[PDB]
Amino acid sequence: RTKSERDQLYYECYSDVSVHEEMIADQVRTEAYRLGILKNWAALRGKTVLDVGAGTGILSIFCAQAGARRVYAVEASAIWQQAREVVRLNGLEDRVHVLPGPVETVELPERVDAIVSEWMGYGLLHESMLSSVLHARTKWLKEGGLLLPASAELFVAPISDQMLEWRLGFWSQVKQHYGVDMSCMESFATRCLMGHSEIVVQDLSGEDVLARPQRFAQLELARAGLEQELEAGVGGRFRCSCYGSAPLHGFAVWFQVTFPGGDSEKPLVLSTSPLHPATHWKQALLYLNEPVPVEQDTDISGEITLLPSPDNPRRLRILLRYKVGDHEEKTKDFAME
Amino acid sequence: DQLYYECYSDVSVHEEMIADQVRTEAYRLGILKNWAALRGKTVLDVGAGTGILSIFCAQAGARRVYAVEASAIWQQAREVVRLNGLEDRVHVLPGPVETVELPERVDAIVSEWMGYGLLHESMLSSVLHARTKWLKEGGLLLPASAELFVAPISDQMLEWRLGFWSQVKQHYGVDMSCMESFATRCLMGHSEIVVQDLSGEDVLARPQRFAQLELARAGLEQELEAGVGGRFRCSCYGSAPLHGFAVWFQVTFPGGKPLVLSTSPLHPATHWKQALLYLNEPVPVEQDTDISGEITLLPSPDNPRRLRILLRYKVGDHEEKTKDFAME
Ligand SMILES: Nc1ncnc2c1ncn2[C@@H]1O[C@H](C[C@@H](N)CC[C@H](N)C(=O)O)[C@@H](O)[C@H]1O
């Protein structure tokens, strides 16, 4: 529960193979970084890069292959030892330098032309890694230098989760299967599956989205003052109108990040929307205590704030205020599962 | 004991059990096919949960069912019984079966008590306690017995995970084949029992029964404390990387031909899956490679409800080895 304990647990996760397997098997993520880096070949060719949180080294290697002269691959967990071997295996150890330890205390021999980092957690800010990237930017990035990605956006949409609907309806189906009526279990199932205060990470599709998604916050990484916004809360108000009739279960929150277009003048966007190909981040679901019926053109509005949890700064908290239709204003406070 | 019961106060575990069609149909038929033995008789359902097995017992013709449940889910069972119009015949009694005050000894006990690797959760002791305390002489136990099996395995999913690092170069133009030894240490080098579902083609040799538990047998309770299990030997089907062993179980109901509920990878899948015991790294085997060993299931020293498995094994002419596992 102390910082040293919390740090050891966080980096211990990244010392193990499973999380790296997940990240690198995520083709949408990994290919987006590869292409985003290549899009910026003109600005990277012959230049220096800092990879904040290099992991197994893969993004740093992408940067070298794109023509970077020198890459500092900084990694705080024990996985740096594996990165060292990956870099050597690819013939890159003379110019990709795997550096152990936190980026906050690394000492590079020079400021750098570019920073690359994959720092995003569930609901964007779970893990709270962004502070480390901003620290590195302030301390090591040259004036006018390149950030990859350069920005993040947060989106919300109201949802009718088809999988949840099935799980709640299960109990009224038992009679047909086994000859025992359990339809009375539905209220209890609803309390268990919806009445908790955890953020649920689950993949949705367009079939679950009840209104046009809306951006409710923007994080431009070059902006001074972003560090202090993180502490006070990131988010904003939203308002949308429903497509059609459905049981409203709550809200899905997701994000995108954008890589500069470079020479092409066409930015590359990595999205975790339910309307786009699936990623390991899925979406972050905020369930209401029970389903609320809605109809075509029902207004839903609210305010969403992403904060660090008081107990654990790396654990995402979300404060939700919302109003459905003519119902009273309600609030719910969530923490990451 | 309360943290354990608290697991069952939530809907998800009961959804998983009742959505397990192989499990629930096997109990349903095991009970209904015993109509002649249950007709006009009394039943104790040990750990009634949502009450579903007690309602099957009523359908089989039981004159009365005491449905005993320690977790807060007993409240939902009472509602289910009322909804099915059985409040006059099926009586939900809250609390541990060890201390419940039944009105009378019973003609039969039904219970679904099995955990991962059969004995994880350690609920069998509660069923045997109830049998000693409340079952009439010559009374019926459903299921009546359990059997434990082992086979050597080559886990396809594990092989794919280990092989993933050699595939990265084709996906992204970065070689990561050097990660394979590290991945193997992480995924196999630990001492946790891993619950995972296998298929028939993961099985490398004929499965061996290594223990039988007759629930009516005298002194079974003390055996559980000392450990349950036994020796086994088998010959491999063909060439493959041996990853370790899978342990699974079946239970048998009195026939009313005996109905068997199996959790074998060769039979339809169940929520129990199999309990996998990984060697520290893969070992190549061939057709007719001899494998022998001994497996013991114990309660963990620091947590009686947590399964521990002691494995001794010998592959071909390699030296005998041991590995000591506890449930993940
Ligand atoms: N303050 C920090 N300094 C250095 N590394 C960090 C820090 N915070 C988190 N990390 C590492 O950042 C990595 C974050 C991963 N999302 C990315 C790994 C790798 N770049 C990849 O894209 O596959 C993990 O390996 C963490 O251990």
Ligand SMILES: Nc1ncnc2c1ncn2[C@@H]1O[C@H](C[C@@H](N)CC[C@H](N)C(=O)O)[C@@H](O)[C@H]1O
């Ligand atoms: N000592 C005990 N006394 C009463 N109930 C118990 C005891 N130990 C475990 N249980 C309950 O036993 C049930 C075990 C379940 N595997 C079976 C539930 C139900 N009979 C069903 O087949 O769906 C859980 O609901 C536990 O809470």
